[PDB]
Amino acid sequence: ISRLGGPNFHEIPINRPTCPYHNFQRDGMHRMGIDTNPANYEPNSINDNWPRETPPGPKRGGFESYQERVEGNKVRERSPSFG
Amino acid sequence: DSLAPEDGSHRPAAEPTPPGAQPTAPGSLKAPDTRNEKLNSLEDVRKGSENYALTTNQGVRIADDQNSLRAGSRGPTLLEDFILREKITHFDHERIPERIVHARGSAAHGYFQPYKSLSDITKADFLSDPNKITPVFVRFSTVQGGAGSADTVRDIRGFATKFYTEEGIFDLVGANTPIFFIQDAHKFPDFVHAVKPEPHWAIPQGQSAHDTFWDYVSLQPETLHNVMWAMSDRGIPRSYRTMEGFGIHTFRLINAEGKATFVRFHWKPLAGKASLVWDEAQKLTGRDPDFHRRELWEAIEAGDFPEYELGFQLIPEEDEFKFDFDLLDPTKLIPEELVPVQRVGKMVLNRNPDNFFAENEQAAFHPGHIVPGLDFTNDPLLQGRLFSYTDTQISRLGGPNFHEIPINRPTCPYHNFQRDGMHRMGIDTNPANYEPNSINDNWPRETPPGPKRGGFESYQERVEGNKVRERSPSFGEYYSHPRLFWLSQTPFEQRHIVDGFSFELSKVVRPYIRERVVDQLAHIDLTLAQAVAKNLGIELTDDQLNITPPPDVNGLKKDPSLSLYAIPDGDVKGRVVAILLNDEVRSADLLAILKALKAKGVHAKLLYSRMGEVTADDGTVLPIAATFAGAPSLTVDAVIVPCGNIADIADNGDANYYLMEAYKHLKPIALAGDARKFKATIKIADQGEEGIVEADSADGSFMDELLTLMAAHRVWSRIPKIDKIPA
Amino acid sequence: DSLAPEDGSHRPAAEPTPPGAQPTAPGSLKAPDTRNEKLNSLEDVRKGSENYALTTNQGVRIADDQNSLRAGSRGPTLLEDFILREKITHFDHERIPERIVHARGSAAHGYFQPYKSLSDITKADFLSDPNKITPVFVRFSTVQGGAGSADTVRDIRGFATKFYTEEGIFDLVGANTPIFFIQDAHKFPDFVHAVKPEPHWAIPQGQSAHDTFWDYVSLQPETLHNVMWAMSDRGIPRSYRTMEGFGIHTFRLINAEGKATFVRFHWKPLAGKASLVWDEAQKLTGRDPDFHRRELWEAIEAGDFPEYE
Amino acid sequence: DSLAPEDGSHRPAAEPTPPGAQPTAPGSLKAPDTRNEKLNSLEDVRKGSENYALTTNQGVRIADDQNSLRAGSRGPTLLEDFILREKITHFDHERIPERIVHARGSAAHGYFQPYKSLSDITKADFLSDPNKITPVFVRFSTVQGGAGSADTVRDIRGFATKFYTEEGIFDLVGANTPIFFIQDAHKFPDFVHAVKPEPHWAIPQGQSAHDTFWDYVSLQPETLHNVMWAMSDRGIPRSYRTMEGFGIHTFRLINAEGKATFVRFHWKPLAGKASLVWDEAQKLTGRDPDFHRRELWEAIEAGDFPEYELGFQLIPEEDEFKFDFDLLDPTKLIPEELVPVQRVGKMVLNRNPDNFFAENEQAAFHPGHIVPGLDFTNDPLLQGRLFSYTDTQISRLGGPNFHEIPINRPTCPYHNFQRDGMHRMGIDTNPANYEPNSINDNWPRETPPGPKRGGFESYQERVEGNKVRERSPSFGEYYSHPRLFWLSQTPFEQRHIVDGFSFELSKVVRPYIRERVVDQLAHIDLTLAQAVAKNLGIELTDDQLNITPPPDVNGLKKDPSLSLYAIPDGDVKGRVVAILLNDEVRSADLLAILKALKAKGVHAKLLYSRMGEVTADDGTVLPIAATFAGAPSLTVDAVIVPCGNIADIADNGDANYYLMEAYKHLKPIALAGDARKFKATIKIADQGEEGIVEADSADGSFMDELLTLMAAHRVWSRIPKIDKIPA
Amino acid sequence: EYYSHPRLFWLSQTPFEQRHIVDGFSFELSKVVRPYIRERVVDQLAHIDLTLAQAVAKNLGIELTDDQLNITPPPDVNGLKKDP
Numbered sequence A: 001i002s003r004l005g006g007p008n009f010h011e012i013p014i015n016r017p018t019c020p021y022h023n024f025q026r027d028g029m030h031r032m033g034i035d036t037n038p039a040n041y042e043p044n045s046i047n048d049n050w051p052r053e054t055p056p057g058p059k060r061g062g063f064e065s066y067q068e069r070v071e072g073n074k075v076r077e078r079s080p081s082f083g
Numbered sequence B, D: 001d002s003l004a005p006e007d008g009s010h011r012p013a014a015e016p017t018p019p020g021a022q023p024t025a026p027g028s029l030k031a032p033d034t035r036n037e038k039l040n041s042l043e044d045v046r047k048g049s050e051n052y053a054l055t056t057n058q059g060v061r062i063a064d065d066q067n068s069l070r071a072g073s074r075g076p077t078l079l080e081d082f083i084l085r086e087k088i089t090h091f092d093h094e095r096i097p098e099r100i101v102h103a104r105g106s107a108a109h110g111y112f113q114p115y116k117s118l119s120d121i122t123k124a125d126f127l128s129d130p131n132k133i134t135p136v137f138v139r140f141s142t143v144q145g146g147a148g149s150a151d152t153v154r155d156i157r158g159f160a161t162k163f164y165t166e167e168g169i170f171d172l173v174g175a176n177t178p179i180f181f182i183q184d185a186h187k188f189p190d191f192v193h194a195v196k197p198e199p200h201w202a203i204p205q206g207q208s209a210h211d212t213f214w215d216y217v218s219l220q221p222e223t224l225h226n227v228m229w230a231m232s233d234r235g236i237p238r239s240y241r242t243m244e245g246f247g248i249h250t251f252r253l254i255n256a257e258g259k260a261t262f263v264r265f266h267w268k269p270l271a272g273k274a275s276l277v278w279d280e281a282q283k284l285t286g287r288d289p290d291f292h293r294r295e296l297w298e299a300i301e302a303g304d305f306p307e308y309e310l311g312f313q314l315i316p317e318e319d320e321f322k323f324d325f326d327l328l329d330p331t332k333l334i335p336e337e338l339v340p341v342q343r344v345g346k347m348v349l350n351r352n353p354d355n356f357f358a359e360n361e362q363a364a365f366h367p368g369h370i371v372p373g374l375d376f377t378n379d380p381l382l383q384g385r386l387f388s389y390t391d392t393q394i395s396r397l398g399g400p401n402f403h404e405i406p407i408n409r410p411t412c413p414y415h416n417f418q419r420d421g422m423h424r425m426g427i428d429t430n431p432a433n434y435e436p437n438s439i440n441d442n443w444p445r446e447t448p449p450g451p452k453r454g455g456f457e458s459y460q461e462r463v464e465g466n467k468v469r470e471r472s473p474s475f476g477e478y479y480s481h482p483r484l485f486w487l488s489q490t491p492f493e494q495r496h497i498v499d500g501f502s503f504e505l506s507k508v509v510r511p512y513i514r515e516r517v518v519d520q521l522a523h524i525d526l527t528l529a530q531a532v533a534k535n536l537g538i539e540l541t542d543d544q545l546n547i548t549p550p551p552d553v554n555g556l557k558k559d560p561s562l563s564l565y566a567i568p569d570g571d572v573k574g575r576v577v578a579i580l581l582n583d584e585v586r587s588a589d590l591l592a593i594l595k596a597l598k599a600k601g602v603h604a605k606l607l608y609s610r611m612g613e614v615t616a617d618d619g620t621v622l623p624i625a626a627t628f629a630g631a632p633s634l635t636v637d638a639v640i641v642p643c644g645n646i647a648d649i650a651d652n653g654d655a656n657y658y659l660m661e662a663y664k665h666l667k668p669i670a671l672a673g674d675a676r677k678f679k680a681t682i683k684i685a686d687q688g689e690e691g692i693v694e695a696d697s698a699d700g701s702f703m704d705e706l707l708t709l710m711a712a713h714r715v716w717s718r719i720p721k722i723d724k725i726p727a
Numbered sequence C: 001d002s003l004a005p006e007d008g009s010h011r012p013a014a015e016p017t018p019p020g021a022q023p024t025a026p027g028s029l030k031a032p033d034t035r036n037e038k039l040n041s042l043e044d045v046r047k048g049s050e051n052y053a054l055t056t057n058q059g060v061r062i063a064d065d066q067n068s069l070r071a072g073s074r075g076p077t078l079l080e081d082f083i084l085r086e087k088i089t090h091f092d093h094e095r096i097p098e099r100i101v102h103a104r105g106s107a108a109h110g111y112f113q114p115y116k117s118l119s120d121i122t123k124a125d126f127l128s129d130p131n132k133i134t135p136v137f138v139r140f141s142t143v144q145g146g147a148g149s150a151d152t153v154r155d156i157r158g159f160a161t162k163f164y165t166e167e168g169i170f171d172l173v174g175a176n177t178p179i180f181f182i183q184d185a186h187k188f189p190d191f192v193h194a195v196k197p198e199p200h201w202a203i204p205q206g207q208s209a210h211d212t213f214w215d216y217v218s219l220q221p222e223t224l225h226n227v228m229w230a231m232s233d234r235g236i237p238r239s240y241r242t243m244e245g246f247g248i249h250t251f252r253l254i255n256a257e258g259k260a261t262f263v264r265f266h267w268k269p270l271a272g273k274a275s276l277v278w279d280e281a282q283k284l285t286g287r288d289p290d291f292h293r294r295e296l297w298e299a300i301e302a303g304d305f306p307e308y309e
Numbered sequence E: 001e002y003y004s005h006p007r008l009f010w011l012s013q014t015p016f017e018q019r020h021i022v023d024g025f026s027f028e029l030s031k032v033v034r035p036y037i038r039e040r041v042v043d044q045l046a047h048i049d050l051t052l053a054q055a056v057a058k059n060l061g062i063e064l065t066d067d068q069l070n071i072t073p074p075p076d077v078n079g080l081k082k083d084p
């Protein structure tokens, strides 16, 4: 945000994905992309909810975190195992 | 040169003065004796002006500040004019990014004091002793509009309090409604974008009356509760002084023994609850877009300090699951009939800022700014808010040194190993910039948690579950709170809700979105849905007619604390009365009128068809504050027309319209002597009607009757009479 | 889930329609066949949306845009939710400083064409050939108010035209009155501070009716000429389409032989001159603060293209 | 906690101590009683540390600064950890843009005082009385490299002085050579881009030895004069204390009558002029890239305060066109033989900063920042500089309020109608933010120009001519100054210039560039041109050999003030001697050595093959400062090898190498008793050699000879002998 | 020179435009809290046109003084008494 001047640093040439990127984020300093989506939010019926979420799958699915088991108290504590 | 007028009328008196009597002024000049620790701490950066030479920013005296340096008096401006370039450069970079939301806000300084020690339930230092005074800086705001948007729009209002405590900044960042529109912070941008001006053309400003807002609302039923509050009169407060305040989220209080108590924060307006009516609020955005900002400032200058009572809804850890709704769900309120608000302390706002930009615009509030004795909960909206408020000021306030901006600075000590960053003010002398260190003997040092003055330690809440992107099933109920709110409103409040929805939906261009919202309302209450549907020329289907209403909230079919007006809490101090003058006013009425108002701290504005003066019947010279068109009825709370030469203003359209507008907006109207001729303007029968004070003169009970009407705020019985009337 | 109605009434017809007939929309969707060199040159950055997967800014498909990642469904949000932090970070940094002056403005794209070659008096390429079209982008504005202030206030209006010519950008940055309030730029900050919201309390917005402006005017008689224009009905135009445009200053035209000709620039509204009346304008700031922005956008959507000579 | 050593040896003594005796420290901790108005005025932002609690920036005490908040001790970090995020956020935004040029610099605080009142020629307040003490902040620098580049590169050096006068900030932003490379500010970006690291790969750092630099130079003959200074030993100063300072541009002095005098500013180093030799400089960039920064800091901590004499070259307005060069041409110097330097005052640098980032990195120097009594000229380089230095800190320092950053703040009053801007610190209480105003009675007010405390008024210079983008024909002469400079150097200085050009052009990959630069050298001097050409394997042409040299500068065929060494002025106070120890040192030698050095203020570093200590013959325990490899001879001014057990170090490669390096680099070497066996390693005749001190022991006479050699800096007669020593 | 153009503009307006100009100044000046500021502006209006000055002054309940009533109107602009 300070180093590259804002939240649009992914629009700097070198940082641009080569694959498609579409979402409901807008504006920010030095905004390059000009969005034509009628909607800047989801869910929306005005652009028939596009761009749309994608279920996780074997290929080309949405990102879904591994459902790791969490259990313990909220602590600021180093694990004894790291000692 | 020496341009002030001999007589010193350019300068306002440094003593409390009613609204409009003197030119308003910077707080330190208007009330120099009103102090607190934070106000005194700002003295290092306060800058005067009088008797000082005009200079550049580098301290060089300027000889000629009217002209650019040029080659010849009609020649080209030279690049060497550094005085011109510095003055234009500062001007050219004056603006900073406004807040993403709540850009429009009005702020003041004040103080807080607890009624009694709260040590049994919290170790927070500012609540530990009744004699402990905590300086505060409060900012009230709207949500959607930009910094230059209008004040009296229909919107939620922000209510942020910066508590400058002895153990750190505590920021209580709330709103004027007890719930928020969404459940999880991940959809904040979605909701905000939907309510903000649409991206193609940036319309509309300060309004949720547009397709994208209602599109989102219709697809996300969790928003219905707060939508109900916004559509009610709560969305158009009379002033920041007459609205409630809430922290919304369930937080924790942590005592010295380590016991956690759930808490919801409340602010009770000591001036009471009061709102405008839609037509007045909308019109008032046009006649005076700074109405709330002005009213706040002028109340403080008159000495009518906005006073609020901090209150706590306290829920034992063992009762976390005893309600129909989840305590961590921010779209759900905790009914006061179930959990009473316990009075905790008083906040008094008694001084305006010196410079709006420096103090108001640069102030940074953030709900993650808590102190030992307080803690968070897992409320999913609150959780995400903690990320946002530190993040956003890297752009808004240019960097991570924003706590060094005067208004944001802690009054208590602050020492750590953080260094550099843009705009670095503090010059650290610590030999070490890391810990652990031996070269400065590990200072500054960590401090263990303890009963008082100890380090922050989070409450050891048990966390158990899988890493999931999942809404708790307990959050999946959307209509029972909306319904509870609906049923707690008076009949005229309900009509106003119906009217808000109807008006807003009429501005939605795509008819199907209107139908879909109507379908949602039918899940809340049939009467409500039917009435809105009728105003939109939509017919409910038989299926919609049999949607079974949501269950009561823990057995409650209503809760009168949810209404603005069901339970009287009328305060008249700080209100204002318009006085329609004529060119031969009966001075006796005027003396009776003005003294009765002053006795109760009610202000008056003397209006006429032009500015200047008017001479009463006995030669008393009356100073005119404004013309009838210049200070419309929208800005006052009641109108009085004293006896005198009524034919002077009898056929004055503006004067007549003044009364028609105030009559329509349900404000008390009082007519003395021949001012009763105006009754035919508002269609009042000979025998009179509740809400209209009338008598042969302004003597006897005339002012007490008028003041009783003001105490009840508006004449709600007149609603049916306003239906027709062309105003 | 939440989808378009069956009838396709969510989307505006892509043809000229009268104000109110269809929901308004982005220019390239409303009038896809309306082109010019500048508009086409913007095609490298235009981004569609229909039929595309919702992603992060790094191009990663999002499975659930309804929730933060947390330990248990009633648990604390985790710091590793990069989807959430990217989304919030971008939101948190949406705003950029508004213009010091003229913050409130409405803009449109268009084209310019000279009536005849003006080569005898100027070698400027965009005025050299009657059949050589120059794409424009025009921004109309108010002066005092913020970007969120109202449109129909009493104020001077800005009229800025960006000409994308073959020999460079020419910006003709003017106003709706033929003069300005002050004589030397060194006093700009004094004049602007005087008309802007007063420094202690930041009131009033988009209004010159306050002590400091009249104080300045009273001590600086050079402001009287533009003040006269501001106080007239010129200060509350009915539409951006029905006001004059002026460059104010004397500039020069230079021809190919080196001759200099002094020039003052004018814009003549082909829809005529028309203003509101004060009571109407003031009430209109309340009933529709976006009236001029809305009126301009709808005129263009209707085929009633704002034309200036 | 208690990590500091119980003996207290982690904290440096708050007394002046020699280099390496103590750990260096923040200026106010090292010399707390060294005071000046500016330093005292920074006390409001200085922050301590000892005995304080570690806090967030919001003032919240931290209990555990070792761990993040996580669900279970091996669980995921939680988003609610605000203590972590604030610490990481600040860290993440620590860096600000470095200076476009002069990014690498070292700074210190001091004071200036005039020798006499200069009221006859200037009404500048800081020069009006010998008893007026003006605080200063001086930043020295290189030009090309980034902030992390090395100090002893070959480059021009910046010399900026911020004078905190009582009538404003006056920044004298100069360099260590009397001219600049270019004539018009419009070509600055071209020159800088040419010298800076090449655009595709960003190589090379801190060096002009690359194709683009020499390409630009070859095509722009105006650069040759400053190129000559840079290729001379002037480009590699021994220390910032031992180089000259110049303002470069002709400015104006304005007296009370309003008479203008043309002036060029000069800084004379009272420590004398001294430079390293190229191989020593280049190897010093690798052994200690912070050499100059360290030397400045350590001299001030030892009480060897860098002292400079301010001098003025004064030319009457009527003499403007009396030289055969234009006074406004920045590529032209004013020979001191023609216009003598008038000694005006003295500046003493006596205190280091507390925080480098806060005071040095954030300081903003600008040549435009002048005060009444001073004025510009039409120099086209200076003219364009006036736009830049204000402009550049809008990004570098984040906005238009950079003057509120502590180090930049004027000590005198500053008041104006400028408002807001990112990170606004000042809170203006003025009712008005415009002038003229009547509401604050027009304050702050303008001030007419006058003899003292008057507003700034530009000298009314007559401007006549057409608007033209054209170089003045008078500036079109490029070889006479270069020739004058060349002819004013000693034979060995000329030889180092030849070597400078030869080394640099050797690194230019495109051979035609080397040839074009040699062609330019042929317009300056045939001898210079032939010598450089022969090192490049280039043959001058017929025509090149016949180019007539440029004319003398106003009859001068040389000016000894342009040479570093032609006229003796060396000072040994503050220099350092390396003393090579052995395991049984003759304690009588040391005693004598150290006593003599301390009498002249020369420092010593005791070196051995390992750390710890050695014991002299009498049981004197001697503490080792560093190893031979640890503190190479590059870091000292001379090397002494005392008598004792020489066989302990006589086969020590590093010991022998220490002497060969010092020898190669023309440093005085002193050998006592059996240390004379080290003569074989540097091939010194039995009978001796000037520059090598040798005796049976290290006595008074021996120390006198060594100290005499050190005052002459280097042993120039040894040059023709270092050729045959493999080091 | 500050009054000739203001006056040229004033005389070029129709009667209803002139009234609207009057109403604009009167409205604006009524919102000026310091009365001396209003009076100073009215004084400046008397240097432009007395009919205009007097109409505003009356709406502000201000009386033009005898000196104000005797201020000579500014010269016409290169002979123009109006420009439609």
Ligand code: HDD
Residues within 6 Å of the ligand: B099, B100, B101, B102, B105, B139, B140, B141, B157, B158, B159, B160, B173, B174, B175, B180, B184, B185, B188, B247, B248, B249, B330, B363, B364, B365, B381, B384, B385, B386, B388, B389, B390, B392, B393, C088, C092
């Ligand atoms: C995750 C994002 C997030 C969420 C879900 C919320 N907001 Fe927020 N809030 C913002 C992100 C934010 C912000 C972008 O960080 C803001 C913009 C300006 C700033 O300083 O803070 C802000 C400011 C802001 C302020 C104005 C502070 C001032 O006056 O400067 C108010 C009173 C609140 N909001 C109140 C709330 C409450 C009652 C909300 C729901 C309980 C809420 N906000 C949800």
Ligand code: HDD
Residues within 6 Å of the ligand: D099, D100, D101, D102, D105, D139, D140, D141, D157, D158, D159, D160, D173, D174, D175, D180, D184, D185, D188, D247, D248, D249, D330, D363, D364, D365, D381, D384, D385, D388, D389, D390, D392, D393
């Ligand atoms: C046209 C612009 C330009 C030109 C012609 C010059 N420079 Fe410069 N210089 C700058 C534009 C600038 C700058 C871009 O504005 C800088 C760098 C960063 C900053 O604060 O100022 C600066 C920094 C800077 C500094 C560093 C101040 C400090 O230590 O922070 C020194 C000593 C000089 N310059 C000196 C010179 C000399 C003596 C010049 C020729 C006589 C020269 N500059 C020409």
